[PDB]
Amino acid sequence: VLTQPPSVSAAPGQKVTISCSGSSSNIGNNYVSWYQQLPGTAPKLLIYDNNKRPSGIPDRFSGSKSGTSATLGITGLQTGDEADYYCGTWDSSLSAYVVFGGGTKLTVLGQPKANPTVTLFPPSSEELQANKATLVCLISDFYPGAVTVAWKADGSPVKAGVETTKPSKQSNNKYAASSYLSLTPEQWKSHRSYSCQVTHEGSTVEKTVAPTE
């Protein structure tokens, strides 16, 4: 039960602070560490013993503890600093265990808005022949990484049968997302056209398919 703000943001070159609040049985009476976790890596130790920094950690990382809370500090922050940050300590109550914070996600300001590119595929003939039908909508190269997706049967929406992914950062530092609509071949051949409609930053892109015309 260690409390951190869920997210923090600043421009490259500036300073940030991440706070972590607890009780006297944990932060108050023990030593605080900070861990950094870049996407898909082992957590790395940034700061230990409240303010000590291991050999091999840049000196623009700084730590402090005051009473019942602790704060991590990063100066001259570069884009490579974008990660989830966790505080950790020891709880000295009868519980007797190692306790962590919720994490805060540090994002760095400024990358240009990138409007999303949308590809829509209808069911393949061999899949229809296997008595199933899947419409696939692929969305790539958008920033920032938040889109909503809406399906249309002819002209009216359908909510049933839809599966969409969480958007995820691609290798080129933009975002991607997949949405799948699962139908029977009877339903598929039953309509004039189907539409996938991607809404990103108050703008709309919409692609259409029809039962091979």
Add this chain to the structure above:
Amino acid sequence: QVQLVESGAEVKKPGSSVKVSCKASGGPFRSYAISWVRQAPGQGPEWMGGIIPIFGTTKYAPKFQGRVTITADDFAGTVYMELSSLRSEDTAMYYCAKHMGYQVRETMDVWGKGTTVTVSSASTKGPSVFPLAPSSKSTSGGTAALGCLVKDYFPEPVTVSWNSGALTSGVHTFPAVLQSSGLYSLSSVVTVPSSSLGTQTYICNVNHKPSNTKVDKRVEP
């Protein structure tokens, strides 16, 4: 000069046990404590327990007390973590980490890369591969998108390459989706020029090692 390496991914049905291992270079007999920490997807880390060197005493988090068991074989420099009566909530990333000293009350300075255990009610199934054909609906600007649908497989992961490895620049393989059937499905797209489309031959190479199936599938208009 001390490195940690855990065992491979595990897939388990509810109610079963799982025993993960962690191997240390340097060492090999320890003079440092070692802990296990899990992280559920989109969650803060969670300490499970740890083991003191020499004396072998163990400490477990209150939450896992009684269904987690931590042990060490000193002659091989290896510690184990065993979690029993698995539920779906136990699905997480599982790290081992060493302490900068002999007490679990101390900073964890070195961590292993991590290992996943997945708890699901599904059985292991190979995927079906379907072509996502280019067509006139995907052709603009002298480019054309085409791809592969890898449908209904368990468990992760799957491997998709193109023309047996030749095509790479201009290839996107999207992260999977998890259906309510508890099966996975993903898509892999390669962006190429409009002109080559008919002359050029494109083949996707899908590999699902868990069910020992390799599917190769041509994608044509």
